[PDB]
C-alpha cells in the first residue's frame, strides 16, 4: 500500500522529512523539554484529520501520554486558528494516560482494537502518538545491568508499534527526552535556536536530504 504523509504545519520541516510524517513508519523525535517535540505531537493530532490537499489523511489520532504532556486546550487553539471546529477535532483524538511501562504495552494492544474497528470507516485511525515513549522504561528498568532488559522490553514495544504502522497504514509518532541502539524508522533531533525558532536535524538519514529545517511554535501549533 502507498505511504501516506501528514504535514507538520511547517513547509521547512515537511521538506526535511521528504514530504511529511510517513505512514508505515515510526518517526522518533527527540530533544529537551520545550524543543518542540510535544508541540509537534499536538499539531500532527490536528493535521492528520485534514483532507490530503490540506496535508492530512482524513483520519483520527490516538495519543498515549506517559508524563502529563497532553493539553486538550492546545489542540483546541490549533484547531480554531486553522479554521476547524475545536469540539469535532478533540472528538477525533482518543487519549490515554499510561501509568507505567506494562500499562503502556497493554494500551498498544487496546489501540489495535480501535484501529481495527475504524479501519474501513470514513475516518480511520491514521496517527498513533506515544509521548516520551521511554520515560517509564527508563524509570523502571534501572540500575546495575538493567540496560539489556530495558533494551529487550523497548525492542518488543517498538516491534508491536512497527506492526501497527505497517499492518494498518498508520503513522506512529514517538517522542523522547535526550551509544544505545534505536529501532525507529526515522530519528529527528530538535533544538531551540536563535530568534525563538526550533531547528530540526535528521539523525543517521542519508536516504533523505542533507540540511536542517527551521520552524516556529505558534497559535497554529507548528509553522515556518
Amino acid at each position: 500500500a502507498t505511504i501516506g504523509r501528514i504535514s507538520t504545519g511547517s513547509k521547512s520541516l515537511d521538506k526535511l522529512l521528504g514530504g511529511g510524517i510517513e505512514t508505515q513508519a515510526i518517526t522518533e523525535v527527540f530533544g529537551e523539554f520545550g524543543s518542540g517535540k510535544t508541540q509537534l505531537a499536538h499539531t500532527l493530532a490536528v493535521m492528520v484529520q485534514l483532507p490530503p490537499e490540506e496535508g492530512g489523511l482524513n483520519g483520527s489520532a490516538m495519543y498515549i501520554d506517559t508524563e502529563n504532556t497532553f493539553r486538550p486546550e492546545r489542540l483546541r487553539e490549533i484547531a480554531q486558528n486553522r479554521g476547524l471546529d475545536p469540539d469535532e477535532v478533540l472528538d477525533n483524538v482518543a487519549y490515554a494516560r499510561a501509568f507505567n511501562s506494562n500499562h503502556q504495552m497493554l494500551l498498544v494492544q487496546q489501540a489495535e482494537d480501535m484501529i481495527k474497528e475504524l479501519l474501513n470507516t470514513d475516518r480511520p485511525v491514521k496517527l498513533l502518538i506515544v509521548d516520551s515513549l521511554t520515560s517509564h522504561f527508563r524509570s523502571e528498568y534501572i540500575g546495575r545491568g538493567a540496560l539489556a532488559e530495558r533494551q529487550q522490553k523497548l525492542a518488543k514495544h517498538l516491534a508491536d508499534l512497527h506492526r501497527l504502522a505497517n499492518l494498518y497504514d498508520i503513522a506512529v509518532f514517538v517522542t523522547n527526552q535526550v551509544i544505545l541502539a534505536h529501532s525507529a524508522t526515522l530519528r529527528v533531533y530538535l533544538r531551540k535556536g536563535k530568534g525563538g525558532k526550533r531547528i530540526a536535524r535528521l539523525i543517521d538519514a542519508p536516504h533523505l536530504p542533507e540540511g536542517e529545517a527551521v520552524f516556529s511554535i505558534t497559535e497554529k501549533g507548528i509553522e515556518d
Binding site: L90, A94, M114
Partner: peptide
Amino acid sequence: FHTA
C-alpha cells in the same frame, strides 16, 4: 482510550 477516551475522546479528548
